[PDB]
Design a binder for this molecule. Sequence first.
Ligand code: ICS
Ligand code: CLF
Ligand code: CLF
Ligand SMILES: [Fe+3]
Ligand SMILES: [Fe+3]
Lengths: 522, 522, 477, 477
Amino acid sequence: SQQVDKIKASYPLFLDQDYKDMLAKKRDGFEEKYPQDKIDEVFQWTTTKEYQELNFQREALTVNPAKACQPLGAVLCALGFEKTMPYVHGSQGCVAYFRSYFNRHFREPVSCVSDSMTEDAAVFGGQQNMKDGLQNCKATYKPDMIAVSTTCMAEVIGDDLNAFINNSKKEGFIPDEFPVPFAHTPSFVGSHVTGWDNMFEGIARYFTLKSMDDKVVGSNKKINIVPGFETYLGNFRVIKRMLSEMGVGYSLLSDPEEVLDTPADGQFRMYAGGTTQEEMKDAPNALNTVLLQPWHLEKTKKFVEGTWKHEVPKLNIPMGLDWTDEFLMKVSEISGQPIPASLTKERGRLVDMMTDSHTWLHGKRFALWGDPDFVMGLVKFLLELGCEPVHILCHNGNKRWKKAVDAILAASPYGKNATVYIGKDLWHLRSLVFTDKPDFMIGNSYGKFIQRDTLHKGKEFEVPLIRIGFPIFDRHHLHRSTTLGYEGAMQILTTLVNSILERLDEETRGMQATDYNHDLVR
Amino acid sequence: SQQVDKIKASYPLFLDQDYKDMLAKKRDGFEEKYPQDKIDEVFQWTTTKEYQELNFQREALTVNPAKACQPLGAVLCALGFEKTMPYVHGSQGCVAYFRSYFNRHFREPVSCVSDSMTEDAAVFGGQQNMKDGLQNCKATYKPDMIAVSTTCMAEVIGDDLNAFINNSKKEGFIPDEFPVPFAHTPSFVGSHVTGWDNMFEGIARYFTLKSMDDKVVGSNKKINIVPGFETYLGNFRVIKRMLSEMGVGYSLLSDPEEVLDTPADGQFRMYAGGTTQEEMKDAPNALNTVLLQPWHLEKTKKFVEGTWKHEVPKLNIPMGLDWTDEFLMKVSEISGQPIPASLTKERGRLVDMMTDSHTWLHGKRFALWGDPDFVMGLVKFLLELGCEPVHILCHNGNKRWKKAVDAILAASPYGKNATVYIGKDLWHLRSLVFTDKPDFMIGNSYGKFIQRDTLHKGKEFEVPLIRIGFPIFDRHHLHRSTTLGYEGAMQILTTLVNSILERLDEETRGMQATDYNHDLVR
Amino acid sequence: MSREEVESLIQEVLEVYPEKARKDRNKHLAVNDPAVTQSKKCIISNKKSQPGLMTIRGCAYAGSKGVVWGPIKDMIHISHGPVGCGQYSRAGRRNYYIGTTGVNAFVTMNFTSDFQEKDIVFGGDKKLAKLIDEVETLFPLNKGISVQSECPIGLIGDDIESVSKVKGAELSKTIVPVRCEGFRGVSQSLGHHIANDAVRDWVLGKRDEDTTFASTPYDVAIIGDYNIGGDAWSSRILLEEMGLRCVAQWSGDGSISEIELTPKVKLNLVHCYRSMNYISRHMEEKYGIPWMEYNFFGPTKTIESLRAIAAKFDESIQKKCEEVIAKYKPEWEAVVAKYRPRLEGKRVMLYIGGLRPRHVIGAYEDLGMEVVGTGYEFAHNDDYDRTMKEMGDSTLLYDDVTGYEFEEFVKRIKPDLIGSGIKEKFIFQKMGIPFREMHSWDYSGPYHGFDGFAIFARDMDMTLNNPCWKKLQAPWE
Amino acid sequence: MSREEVESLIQEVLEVYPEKARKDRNKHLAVNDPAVTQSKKCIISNKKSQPGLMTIRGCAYAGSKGVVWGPIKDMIHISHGPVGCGQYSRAGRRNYYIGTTGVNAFVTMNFTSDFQEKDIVFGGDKKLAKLIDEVETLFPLNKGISVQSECPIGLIGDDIESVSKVKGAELSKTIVPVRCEGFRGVSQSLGHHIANDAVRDWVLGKRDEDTTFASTPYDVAIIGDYNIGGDAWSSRILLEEMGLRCVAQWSGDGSISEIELTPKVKLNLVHCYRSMNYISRHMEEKYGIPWMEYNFFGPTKTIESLRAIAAKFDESIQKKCEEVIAKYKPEWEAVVAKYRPRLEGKRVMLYIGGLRPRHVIGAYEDLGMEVVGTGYEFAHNDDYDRTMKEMGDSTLLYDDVTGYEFEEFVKRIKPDLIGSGIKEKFIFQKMGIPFREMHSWDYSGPYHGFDGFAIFARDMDMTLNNPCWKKLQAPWE
Ligand code: ICS
Ligand code: CLF
Ligand code: CLF
Ligand SMILES: [Fe+3]
Ligand SMILES: [Fe+3]
């Protein structure tokens, strides 16, 4: 039943007595459900350390992974170029899933096409599909350029993208001059960030490999910036802003912030902003190339050093205090521009915020997960704040990255009780936060279920989730946030300290029981 | 007892069994406490409507007010000028309280001095105290100018600031050329915003009243900007930024953002930034003067129109879509500069966020309180979002402001169930939110106790608090937020929608009870 | 109306495409004529999409794992293959259930084999067996396992059937292999067919010799209701108030025991014909159980369906049906009186997968709203036969519409409200036309039945008449 | 160190002031010599502040309402006058209590008369009576009311004592008028004196004729502990583990009944001498109750105080004292072993109100830390008499220090840690020297007793050795 003046959605209208009776009857009559005591005992067992040993003995089963497949990153990289259509050579279900994923994260239109390969292509390949799809895409949606990636179907079959595109150009399906860069992005190798790296490397190859004769390093007096897989628009904005205040000429490569933040003014813009073809062609003339996320752009680094002959600096992600300082001084050294007073003032304001919040920040324990570069930057920043990382998880990490992270952890006493996990999923992390309870988690939306599980053990065992990373599906407009640089450090610090304060306020809200510590001033 | 490896602060170390036994023994032996059933019955009675009628029949007693006294606003206004020392003529306890209040809100040094009037001055006046205080302040802290306000002690005694300062200059205690503007700020009239208005009016009078012969309106081709009582630094920043992108010459009057956000780099700066004396002297040469918060700058408006002969526009606070648009078009008309594409894009992005979050925003009920201009701006924005205001409280409001607010509410169907309260305190609001429960409150830190009370009635009766306004004592760095303009509207919208989503996530976190609606995607 | 201008619009939109794509897509757009019951002479469906045209269709894996097998709460579904497919489909569909997730319920969980290059080269049958052993060790209260196929398994030649047979004999457990690789078929429809065949071959007949279940003449089974935001729940209560006993529920809030008990019911009430017609027909041939389609969208369709269902039973059931109708009449009458004045006369264009583009028309008409265009991602020709008689004269029909076509049609027709998926929501919001997600109900609902009708009206009113839609144009532009 | 260097620094800092201000402030700064017993010969205190020098001192209202009367949980305190005074002091002091706020406890609440111009012109006695009636109607479980005077009431001709008498007779309630107007005296110390006199005149003697309370030879009363962060609680447990019965604590977590029962105890353990010496002396003269000062800051002071308190009672009490000391020895030994190595040798400069500038020295020394400078806002010459022997040789002593003086002294001495209030915290943090709030414990604690010692060490370690202090200089400057 519903009251017309106060209508209830699923929650809490399913809490009405009639629905409760109906559900009880259904369960008791036809579900053949295990007894509740058995369920409770199994849950308690899964909270224990013996279950943790069994969980960490896993070798074949993956439970709730914390990564995606390469073509998603390839599509994200392709969207960062002006009037460019991401084109996935393979099956259409992958494109539907990629578009839904990015729509849910960004709350924005995400454009991508597929050539819709079927079992016939599984027998004879997808050359005809490629020709027809390129022709149809160019005729219908009118892009300036088409960037081609692959699904696992095309990778396993063995389709040769280069020959297919060459035959498309030879048979007149699309003009010879039309730029069609391509990259193989197998989903069984690496993760989405690897797909981003492959896409960018192939695009840079297409636009620069055969024209290096007239290129001179430092001719255009600019610095190339490669962001990598990036899902915070504030990160692009703050990079551009810091480079602008310094008076440093820059060429930012694969800029998707314009197309992912279009205004709503009565018209739909399928393309907006993005790196132009002229910038890509002129990139070898730059003074140097700076890679913002070096741990998933190794192929790009190899191409940039081998062909453009750029001495790529050994720079960490400019996250937190020290690494932002190092990035700024390296940029100053490369460009010859001094660091202005505004950046110094911003750094001082961040240090002031740190001194203001250090008392609440000190000694807090965090589990965290995400991509390698982001995870190491956040761990470094947490160490700078006096926080203690305990469980550090990176599903798509490798052994060298783990060694570098361990080196970072050894350089601070706050990393004494920290363990780095690579190749582990969020079921492993759930076991870890049950057996060695931290104060908070830092991760994407999938962590919320872990939070629920801890509440099931008890209020005293709950580990609240802090939403930083990708993807964020259960909160609005967090994709506009800033993570890199001094501004990003300020935002992260504010989020952390205020999450701590909200938790403390919730724990001390019981009148005549815990409200003696419900201080107005904190 | 304490464990050396896990030391417990007051919470939860007072939850140990020995401390609980000690407290129980103390209460049972010596406190003569009322029985718990009596306490519960009295609490339940105070949650009822009959208690609400008794509460609203109050005429003499004020319980938990939502305002401050004039000299606090006078000090805030004085701090917005370059190398200016706020000077309060009266008793030192007031200055100690003002400094502690602003220290707790801003987490920054706040400089102010008093002449420390005592019982001796209660029969002779504070003339000697004024002379010695001005001399000592100038000699010790070396300000470029001293702005003088008063405590209630000086107001009741009747000290004449003008004669005291003139005699100080005549007797050589301070140089005749040294600028010493003054204003009477009685604490029994109005509130802190009235003190800001009086302080600013006296300063502008001091710097412009006797030199209007050579002033010509529009000579300097600038627009004067008066912010009023403002505790969000992002508001000053966004006003300056918006005026800058438009290419409009502006003169911001009483800018305290620099002195309230100094960096921490090893030195203490007592003064930083602020409006210069040259700008104040040249203000009458501006094209016009725009008042950001017209409802507490009426005396300033009277002075500006009467003496500077500026046609002050009838503009609301530039909060939310419509009023930000009106402010921008009025500035464009006055200055002759067109509105650029960047502002249009920012407005479109705000509209896009509104369309993205409208489903969760629609129909939500809010109680709110604060200063008149801020309250009316937030009510207008909530109406624009499709939200329903229910309880609107403004302790320092008046009848004309209430009439204007009622006119705003009548122009939207979402204001049908809204009531405006002036002269009411937060005990009245506690009664209102017990008897007509909204979904959320919007106000300053003092609302937290109200939240506590609701939790005591039950989880189903809890009304969460949303911290927008002044002062914010239990969260860190919220004073850096933005409230005015499109950026402020974006921040407010994000805060509101995400508070709604956190509440929903908390309500649906119960395993096998309410977690069927614990969706990953919202 | 004005059929001729609609045909002119169709041709004008078609002009952009290349020759072959032009002639292919010409057959998939049509002007409705209610007198026509043979839609094959008017519209063509269930064909492969044109490459490079940005279709909305999914794959067979989405049809099988995402739609049919996934909602079953007490069984663990292994997305066998690379990691992407399980990750993008995890908890994306609001199939509601009651259970303790991770102990006896596993719907919102993503189990995958996480294929790497060595698995591609050397096969993954041994890895599948090891994964099954690990699942048994770590989730002891599971009541069955499904193995959902992704593209590489179909491409490399893995025999998951033999592994399933050996492991099921070894552990005395039900292990269902589903060859639901994404390159099969052209959409999620073949996923529906393959999942139904797997249900028939591996699960349905496990209690054929079992006669311990006590049956009643009023036993019914809800087939093809996936409890979107609790939709199935809001249906079952009505059926329970009519005096019928709902034994099984396919597959919203579903359990394997309910599926096993399904062959014992007297009648199969099918909501989604497109996904469950195969198993309904198979049950009719093998057990003799009759099935009937019903519609619980809107009060009118709900009353009609309740009376038609009661007609299959005795007089007491009909009396209870009349009692239920009388009890719920004032509520939806009040809902209509409140919301129809704000909704009367507005025009809607719809584009969903295979059932809703014609099922929700009655609810829209109950609020005085007109559907001017509709279409399907993957419906078959019988679905269009059912659709033609429920749509207005000279209304637009589209099959597997492209993004460009959809945008052009919307820009010309200028409807008041659009209902579609997440991949069109923001496109159409940026153009200033209100949009409702008609797959996940915009994270709201439920919409089935009398209780869901009030939520439906409230949501439609909140989105169609929101003030935000008056603000897209800046006052200085 | 280097006495003559400190005198040179004092003169150098003094050079800036005008002649009269120079002459006055020269008397308030001194170099400590522990052999000196009479502090009048070296330092002058309890004088009026120099106008416009940015003193830290408060007013008499802060001393009376904020410090003494405010902590009493079951009485309602009316800040009679304009609205500012109650608002700025509401919940600013962490005087902890157990109660249901708004029903039987009212500490964190701000009751005020909210004076307007008509009240200034025509008086507010009738408004006071009406307010008292409203308080009785709206807070029936209140056990008493105090009326705290703000500046205008002293300035205008208001007689709150007569109103209190008539209303208390009419309602049979205790109404305490406190003439605590801010212009009286020079600091919060006169507030302490006035509040003590009000307690004596209106509350203390209400049970002089009552002999129903059963007394024991081990009855004691804690005086001058305001339960800052729970400090008083952490003291009481020790005294009750010692075998003594704590009847009342003034006024931390205090109730009016406890104050009424205080004249029945055998001994008054006074923690804050500065604020409660008046009432302790009055109780000694009128009831014959002896009092003694004690220190629970740090294990050394706590053990000394416990043994000294034990000496006042019989042998079993002393045995229980030894038992408590033995029980708590390992905990603070472990705390010292953990934290002293990270704190040994560090130098501290402190500036607080009346008692803590010399009370917390022992706890700092227990961690191997040296206090090089200390001072008081409002303490009297006897407090300096105690401080001279409590402090080390050639250390700096300052009374009612100005902001400029404090900054110059800190810039020259360069301490590793500063202990002061909220009005110096950010000034000294910007200069890069760690700061601990020594009034509110930086929203941490408690620090009293063995349990509080661990928190004290942990907090000092967390602030002194925080990495943030190594980052103030940019690497490019
Ligand atoms: S009462 Fe006094 S200033 Fe003795 S007014 Fe002040 S809670 Fe201080 S040094 Mo704040 S004479 Fe208490 C004090 Fe000491 S408020 Fe507290 S810390 S022991
Ligand atoms: S049509 Fe369907 S969704 Fe596509 S792959 Fe095929 S079953 Fe799957 Fe999963 S891993 Fe990624 S998304 Fe594909 S490319 Fe390799
Ligand atoms: S020394 Fe002390 S705090 Fe000062 S007034 Fe006097 S009792 Fe009070 Fe309250 S209202 Fe404001 S702050 Fe003053 S100026 Fe009139
Ligand atoms: Fe958007
Ligand atoms: Fe600060």
